[PDB]
Structure formats: structure tokens, C-alpha cells
Amino acid sequence: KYYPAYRENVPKKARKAVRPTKLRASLAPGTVCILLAGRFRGKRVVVLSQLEDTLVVTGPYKVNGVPIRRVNH
RNA sequence: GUGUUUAUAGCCUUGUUGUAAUACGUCCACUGGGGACUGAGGACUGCGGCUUCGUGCCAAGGAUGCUGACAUAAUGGU
């Protein structure tokens, strides 16, 4: 079952490399930020740290009830 | 109101105080963001750049990667 049974149009070597996301200078860790979409739209939450593209964000769960969540920048 | 010549304002002209600054024109193989449309091709060759050299890496002969939602729905057609 292993030998290719068809033309096997193997994709050409694509010269695309993964590089780190350049987030905005204003999305530093610790800055208060307003959520725009999702079930928690309109809430204000604190940016703990930046993931590769998203921001690991949370409002103090005793304050606005927004748990440890990810948010797209 | 008449005539004045810095008076208790100063104006213009002239050379002139250390030089300038700015605007406009032009150029940078200088640089930082925002938006939109496209992804044709399909092993490898090539031209280049990094790299002490690299079955090396790269934005260099055309898009890839990471995710999320749905079968009783989603999406489109008539």
C-alpha cells in the first residue's frame, strides 16, 4: 500500500520561513487593555504576557470575572 | 492741526554682527506604520545573500504556517 499509486504531484519547495510575530509597542505586559470581541466584549483586562501571536490576558477574577485567557492582538 | 528727525515710539535704506535658519527643487541601492486585491507554478537544478565550511540557513526561478467553527449544519445552486 506504500508505493505511490498516482502521479504524486509533490509540492515544490516553498521558501516560507516562520518568524516571530512583531506585536505593537503599546501591547506591553501589564498594560490595561479593552477586549473587543468574544463573550467578554467590553471588559478591561490586564495583559500578563505575550504568546507567539496572542496576548495571555486576564482581568483579576475577583474584579471582572475574566479568567486566564488568550486574546488575539 | 503746522513743522519735526528718536526724544519718553520707532520706520525705511545702507553697509554690516557669529553664522545661519527656513521654504522650495532634487536625490538616498535611508527608514517606520495602516489598507486592499492576488497565491499562478508544483521533487531537484538557476541567479544571489548570509555562512570558517556546512545532505547549513535565507524574504534568492509564484503561500505557507498556527488555529477555530459543522453533518439532524455549514456553504452554494435553482
Side-chain angles (χ1 to χ4, degrees), chain A residues 18-58:
Chain A
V18 160
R19 281 166 218 118
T21 295
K22 174 81 182 70
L23 295 181
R24 303 196 283 285
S26 51
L27 289 166
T31 87
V32 179
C33 81
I34 306 176
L35 291 202
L36 284 177
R39 73 161 302 181
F40 297 126
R41 63 173 61 76
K43 304 272 198 172
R44 304 185 173 98
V45 291
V46 173
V47 183
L48 304 186
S49 78
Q50 309 172 342
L51 244 190
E52 72 215 47
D53 161 19
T54 60
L55 305 134
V56 175
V57 101
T58 184

